[PDB]
Amino acid sequence: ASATRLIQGLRNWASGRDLQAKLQLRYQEISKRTQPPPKLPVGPSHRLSNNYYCA
Amino acid sequence: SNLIEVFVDGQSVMVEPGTTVLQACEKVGMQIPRFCYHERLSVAGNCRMCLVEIEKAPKVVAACAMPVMKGWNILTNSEKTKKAREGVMEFLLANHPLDCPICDQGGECDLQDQSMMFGSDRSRFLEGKRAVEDKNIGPLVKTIMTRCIQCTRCIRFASEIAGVDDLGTTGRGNDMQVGTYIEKMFMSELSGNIIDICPVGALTSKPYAFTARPWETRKTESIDVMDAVG
């Protein structure tokens, strides 16, 4: 992504495909390494009524 | 022949008169869950775990204290028997303290085993549990009364086999504690056997306390040589 325009032109001519639009080196488009804390949902049997184990 | 025939799960069996439901169910090779019944102690009938259903009878009977009669059919795997077992397990685990990692009964606990086998998988008790003051009854039996379930095998063992008559049940309601009401040092020739008959970790062996765990112990049978009883 930091490659120069003549190197990009030679690279695109030699490959035959546009390589800058699909770069294999990861950049700032990735998700951040820190996240807000999550709150997980509960299962279908997290109930206080008609939750007998024999059913 | 005075013996009568009863039915368990649609199967006939021949039992003696005066034989309870639990003895017949053990005769057909099944184990009804229990906390207070003992084959060497008197019947108390208070833990209510042994509740089963006789067919054509809309009330569960206690299998540890109900004599059988001719023509009775006993359903030990019906829906209401499992509902009663789950309810009794939930009531027992309502006030039980979260002490399983620091309790010597872990790995050989009756309460944990039958909670896995017959109880539910979650607790609906959102309130605060009770707390019972501890007691000091000697240098052999480590006592933590918070984990007791009031099964009263202490009382029957102390009053029938040891015959010391020191243990008792003080107080009324949920605040009733199994103790001696005073700083009484319970010492006898058969004291440590109460550690055998406690289904919970309320009474533990003081020298053995916090030393090992039953799942990593190899069992080797042997004979006692300290006394000539063998």
Ligand code: SF4
């Ligand atoms: S006696 Fe109570 S604390 Fe100890 S292992 Fe059993 S359930 Fe857990």
Ligand code: SF4
């Ligand atoms: S301390 Fe153990 S044996 Fe004694 S009454 Fe309580 S549960 Fe039963």
Ligand code: FES
């Ligand atoms: S085993 Fe029958 S009530 Fe406890």
Ligand SMILES: [K+]
């Ligand atoms: K015990």
